[PDB]
């Protein structure tokens, strides 16, 4: 279930999309965030994504709508290729392992200021075999 810790974290992630801090994620914001992650959606793809999550239909995504999206547990088979694309934005050198430096670079791009203590802790929580890196298998589980 949702712990007060998970709720605080989803707020940090929300504020990454909410660049202006106005309390809503607009199509413009989603777009600049996706371009940081090497993606490039059209104005149409951005309206559809917002639509898939926008419950009240006001064209924007607030914390409630965001939290609901994040809270719903999605399983594999339902877009396995999407998870693979996500893995690739992190595994910059394509060697199969998300290193601590690769996670930090992705976060730097998103505007997140992270300390060495924070990058290792994110790695630690996803790392299963304890090699201090995240391979595709470990990455998949974190999602599901």
Provide the binding-site residues for ligand TFP, judged by CB under 6 A. 9, 12-13, 16, 90, 98, 103, 112, 114, 118, 121-123, 125-126, 134, 139, 142
- One residue of 2, 11, 22, 71 binding Ca ion per CB under 5 A: 22
CB 134 within 8 A of CB 97: yes
In the list Ca ion, ligand TFP, none, the entry touching 22 (Cβ below 5 to 8 angstroms by class) is Ca ion
Q: How far does the chain reach from its first CA to its final CA, in angstroms? A: 14
Residue 137 as a binder of Ca ion (CB under 5 A): the answer is: no
Distance (Å, rounded) from C-alpha 128 to C-alpha 133?
A: 9
> Using CB under 5 A, which of 27, 66, 91, 139 touches Ca ion?
91
């Amino acid at each position: 279930q949702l712990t007060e810790e998970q709720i605080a974290e989803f707020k940090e992630a929300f504020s990454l999309f909410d660049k202006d801090g106005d309390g809503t994620i607009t199509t413009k914001e989603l777009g600049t965030v996706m371009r940081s992650l090497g993606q490039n959606p059209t104005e149409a793809e951005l309206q559809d994504m917002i639509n898939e999550v926008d419950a009240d239909g006001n064209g924007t995504i607030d914390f409630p709508e965001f939290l609901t999206m994040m809270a719903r547990k999605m399983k594999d088979t339902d877009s396995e290729e999407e998870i693979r694309e996500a893995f690739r934005v992190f595994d910059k050198d394509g060697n199969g392992y998300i290193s601590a430096a690769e996670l930090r670079h992705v976060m730097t791009n998103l505007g997140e200021k992270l300390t060495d203590e924070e990058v290792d802790e994110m790695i630690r929580e996803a790392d299963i075999d304890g090699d201090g890196q995240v391979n595709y298998e470990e990455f998949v589980q974190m999602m599901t």
